[PDB]
Ligand binder design. Structure first.
Ligand SMILES: O=C(CSc1nnc[nH]1)Nc1ccc([C@]23C[C@H]4C[C@H](C[C@H](C4)C2)C3)cc1
Length: 193
C-alpha cells in the first residue's frame, strides 16, 4: 500500500499508444534505509536528504521497477485518492547521475466520486527528454547494458498539500529492464532511518 492516511496512490503507469503498451504499471511492506540512496538524487537543496529530515518518515516510499521495453503517443497516467478535499501539487524530478535534468510541476483539484475524492492526472504527455532517452535505451543489444545505463537514472515524486504546503507523499523510483517473458514488475518499499 503506497500511501498514508491522508493520501494513497491508486494507479500509475507510463505507456505508449499506436492498445496501450505499459513500460511500468502500478494498480491497486519491506523496508529500505534512505542512507542507501542520497547519492542518486540531488543533495545540497530540496534533496532526498533535506525532505526526509523535515519528515514525516511514513510518507516516504521507494519503488523499484523492472520495465518492459519490448513493443505514437507517449503518456503518463496517475491517480490518487483521499477522504479530505484537497488541491495537490505534484512535483516530478528526473535525475541523471545525481543531477536534476527535468522538473515537472502539476496541479490537480479533488473530484468527488463514490464517497471519496479522486485525483486523476491522466494522459499527461511524457516529457521530450524521457521519450528521447527511451528510444535510445531501446536500441541497446543486451539487457545488462540497459541496466548499466539505468543505474544512474532516477525519479523523485513529491506530492504536497498545495494550500498547507504539507508533504503528503514522497516516492523514489529506480529502474531496471525486464524480459518479454517476464512482464513489467514493481516492488514497493518503505524508507526508514
Ligand atoms: O515518474 C514519472 C512521473 S511522469 C513524467 N515526468 N516527466 C515525464 N513524465 N513518469 C515516468 C516513470 C517512468 C518512466 C520510464 C523510465 C524508464 C523506464 C521505463 C520506460 C522508460 C524509461 C520511461 C519507465 C517514465 C516516466
Amino acid at each position: 500500500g503506497l500511501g498514508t492516511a491522508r493520501l494513497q496512490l491508486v494507479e500509475f503507469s507510463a505507456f505508449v499508444e499506436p492498445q496501450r503498451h505499459l513500460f511500468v504499471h502500478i494498480s491497486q511492506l519491506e523496508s529500505v534505509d534512505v542512507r542507501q540512496i542520497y547519492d542518486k538524487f540531488p543533495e545540497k537543496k530540496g534533496g532526498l536528504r533535506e525532505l526526509y529530515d523535515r519528515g514525516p518518515p511514513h510518507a516516504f516510499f521507494l519503488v523499484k521497477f523492472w520495465a518492459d521495453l519490448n513493443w505514437g503517443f507517449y503518456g503518463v497516467s496517475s491517480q490518487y485518492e483521499s477522504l479530505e478535499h484537497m488541491t495537490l501539487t505534484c512535483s516530478s524530478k528526473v535525475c541523471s547521475f545525481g543531477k536534476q535534468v527535468v522538473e515537472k510541476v502539476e496541479t490537480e483539484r479533488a473530484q468527488l466520486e463514490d464517497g471519496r475524492f479522486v485525483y486523476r492526472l491522466l494522459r499527461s504527455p511524457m516529457c521530450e527528454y524521457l521519450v528521447n532517452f527511451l528510444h535510445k535505451l531501446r536500441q541497446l543489444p543486451e539487457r545488462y547494458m540497459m541496466n548499466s545505463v539505468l543505474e544512474n537514472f532516477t525519479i523523485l515524486q513529491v506530492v504536497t498539500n498545495r494550500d498547507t504546503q504539507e508533504l503528503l507523499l514522497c516516492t523514489a523510483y529506480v529502474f531496471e529492464v525486464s524480459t518479454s517473458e517476464r512482464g513489467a514488475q514493481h516492488h514497493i518499499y518503505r524508507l526508514v532511518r
